[PDB]
Design a protein around this ligand. Sequence first.
Ligand SMILES: [K+]
Ligand SMILES: [Mg+2]
Ligand SMILES: [Mg+2]
Ligand SMILES: [Mg+2]
Ligand SMILES: [Mg+2]
Ligand code: NA
Ligand code: NA
Ligand code: NA
Ligand code: NA
Ligand code: NA
Ligand code: NA
Lengths: 221, 169, 178, 96, 149
Amino acid sequence: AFPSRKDAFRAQRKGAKKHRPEIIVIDLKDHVLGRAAAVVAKQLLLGKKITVVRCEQLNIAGTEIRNKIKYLQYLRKRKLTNPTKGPFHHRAPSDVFVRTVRSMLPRYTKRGMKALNSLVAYEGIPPNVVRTGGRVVIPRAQRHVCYRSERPYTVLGNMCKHVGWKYSDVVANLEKARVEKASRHHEKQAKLRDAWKSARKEALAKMPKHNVEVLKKFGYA
Amino acid sequence: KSHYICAGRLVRILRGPRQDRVGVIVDIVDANRVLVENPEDAKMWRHVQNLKNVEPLKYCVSVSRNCSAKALKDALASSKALEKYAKTRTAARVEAKKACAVSTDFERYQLRVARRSRAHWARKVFDEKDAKTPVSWHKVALKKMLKKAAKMDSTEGAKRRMQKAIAAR
Amino acid sequence: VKPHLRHYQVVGRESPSEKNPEPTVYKFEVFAPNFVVAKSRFWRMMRVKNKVKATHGDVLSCKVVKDAKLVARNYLVDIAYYSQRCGYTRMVKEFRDVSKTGAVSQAYHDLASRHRARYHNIEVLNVKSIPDHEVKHLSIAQYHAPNLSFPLLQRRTKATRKDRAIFVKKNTKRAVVA
Amino acid sequence: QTKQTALVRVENVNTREDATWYVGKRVCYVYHGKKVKRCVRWSKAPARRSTTRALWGRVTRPHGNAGMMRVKFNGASVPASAIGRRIRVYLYPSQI
Amino acid sequence: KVSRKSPEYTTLRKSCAPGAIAIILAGRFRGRRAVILKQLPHNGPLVVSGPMKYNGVPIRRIDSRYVIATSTTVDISSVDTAPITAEVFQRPKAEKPTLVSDARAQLQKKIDAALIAAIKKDAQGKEKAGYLRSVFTVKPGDAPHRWNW
RNA sequence: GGCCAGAACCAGCCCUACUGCAUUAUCCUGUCGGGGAUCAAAAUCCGGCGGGCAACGAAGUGCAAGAAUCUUGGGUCUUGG
RNA sequence: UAAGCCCAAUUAGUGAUUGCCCAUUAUUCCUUUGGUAAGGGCGGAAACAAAUGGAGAAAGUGUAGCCCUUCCGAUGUA
RNA sequence: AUCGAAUCGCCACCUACAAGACUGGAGCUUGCUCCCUCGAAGGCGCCAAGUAUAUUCAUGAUCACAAGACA
Ligand SMILES: [K+]
Ligand SMILES: [Mg+2]
Ligand SMILES: [Mg+2]
Ligand SMILES: [Mg+2]
Ligand SMILES: [Mg+2]
Ligand code: NA
Ligand code: NA
Ligand code: NA
Ligand code: NA
Ligand code: NA
Ligand code: NA
């Protein structure tokens, strides 16, 4: 986590710049829990570093009452002789997603532990993830293509709130301020975005005519 | 929009060997199939299409169910649906996608210098506008600092240090 | 998709002998995946109806009957199936299809899903194309409307197999993993 | 498992017809050791001397319908520590 | 009908014809585009000299398996290509063990002068001159298996 | 050099490309009569009559023997040179 | 909008009849071993020093098996 | 400071949001018609700072980790 002084000094000695690995950030809002977990688990075994955000907005098919009961049946499984060192029942929606992915990995191998350690899960979109780059989706695991809309579904955050997750209102307030801040910055920079769109229009009159013909042939003008 | 599946509706084939081709619904079998045909395409004789493989368009010719081939040919020509469709932006995108698929290494290069020439002149146009009214980060930052720095450099002590260390250069 | 059953006309008789110098020639209509199953069904009818075995008879022709041109039609299928609980249950069902083979193939998938009936427990009695005014079921007669239209809703449009991706940017079409 | 043949998933190769284009192409796994050892052009190109090493192979056939390939490495088998790591698929030997 | 023993024998593909502009796939000048001049005798390696003033590729012999011969070509009939023999690239043997010899410097100069004139005489000569100055790279999202060259 | 690697060719194998013969009629057409539903039709449908090839990228029907030489397919680190 | 149940396909009303993955199985290739094994050769053809083409050739159950070609089988407790 | 390494797409235009029984806008006739920016592209980047009048590339000798990498 926090870098050692040896690591920081070697960076000074090496003179290298800031480094960030190739990390995929997935917006898990309106994603099927087990379909997204199966897709992510295969990618982790393929050497991918993956961050998943908005784990509180994952979906499970069925009513919220039946999915709450399915967790309460999971919660009732514990080592009677010693409940410590028994199964650990995590309530956070990101912890539910990580446990689901872990069960789709060979967790008892050094290779399956490497894959699991490449996954970072969050509720909402934390500040260190907001500006890192464009978030992605899994089209084959999205709710609007996976469920018939007549059937009820549950949001993972609402189900988790009633089984022992205490930070539902904290994430709700933090997410409210995130969109409020992001929409203020998106209302700004509209002049910059419109100025670039009009420059690409004005460029078409300045650039060579035969290059505009090539642009039209391939559908870029 | 969502255009209704009706007799006379123009559709585009989504996938399969007839992908990106255009036909007319002509007849509806059930909830899953239709009888598409297009007289002006050689590969689009009357055939059964699954309704998952079609994309309804905004054009609808005036035909009845199970119309003759001659009736559809006259309706398609008079309605000018194919001429109107070819002028749309999504029709030009399908043609451009076909041009990119068969493009050689030379045409891939020619497109690359065309998009670089357009990008170069967009940068030149943006620089002209940016100088006039600041909209980029560095020009907005400069306009916020120009007033404060003028106040700080208007002093005699600032003016003297500037003169002394400019003459040293 | 094209139908999985084919229209067969098997023609055969019992082999001529001293008792039957000129045997009767029988024409049989069957919808089967191939002509080996078609001949098997022909000799099943000959045995249980005419008391003629495949080993004591010969087949005159086992050709496929050509489909008519594809037109949206109403097909009346007279069909029967066997179950241990109820015995033989004969029903008449209407289907919307473009061919006789397609309607019968649809009727076989229908009897499988709704009544758990397999091919060898099913006997087709008659299939024919009927006019719109002889259709009894409202589910079939709703496609006779002169101006029948409907929007395509709740549709899962998968991408072309070449252009399908794993991870795609949220509000763009750009593929991150593909 | 049969370690003599490896499975390689290439980017933007997602069909079996896509993986047939790569049959016979050269495949390389680049890693590093602990000590600097002998390389190609140890004397002709001393700048190449490094702890970096490569293991070479060739694509033999596709695997499944979804753009996978089978790769056979020269003589030996690729180490299991290469699993989940980067593999280089080159454009030679060229058929174009 | 050409015997395998004869110097005129060849099994080279028709795409790697003289005048074809080729992408170099391996070696020091990988990614550069060069012009195929000839094939050395006895089914020998191709000789490519993309105009060395355009991309820096000198008169070099390359194997046909390490080149992508594109469908865009240049008329080479004016270029002599006769003095490029297999003896040009032979080196003396070493006993008890940039610099370019006069013969190699003059051969490169004469061939490339006639090559540049050939490119100019062609329609799209300016576009093909800048085509040879471009560098081929495999980018993220590229699918060379689906491409036509 | 009895070491490593790349390309050439040989022979043998192993894969793909390239297809002809028969068949169709419960079919294809046009026209009369009925019947159908429309605002009016047309069509789905049933009969008589006249012609017939739904036509070879027609048919998902039976069998296919097409010298990868013409007309430079691919692999062999699965063989030996 | 199953990754459930019944039915049905193989890139899909397009133009024909092999989607893919796993064996100590099948086909084929290399090698070993044993046969109720099947055959050939074995009367040194002739010629040929070193300094600068070679070596071997046993009438044989079994060996480093006399040599070469060919076909088939090969697991197993007491 | 050992230390030679594996990694090979940048951005201060994606890096805001929501919806798929629909989110370009109207009309009434409610599935058709009409208008527009015509409803299938995040911008760059792939060797002249830009499409032109150009310029050093070798002998690193035919593949070999790209012999180099702050875009
Ligand atoms: K033996
Ligand atoms: Mg216990
Ligand atoms: Mg046809
Ligand atoms: Mg034994
Ligand atoms: Mg290196
Ligand atoms: Na957990
Ligand atoms: Na598991
Ligand atoms: Na529907
Ligand atoms: Na629906
Ligand atoms: Na003996
Ligand atoms: Na043997």
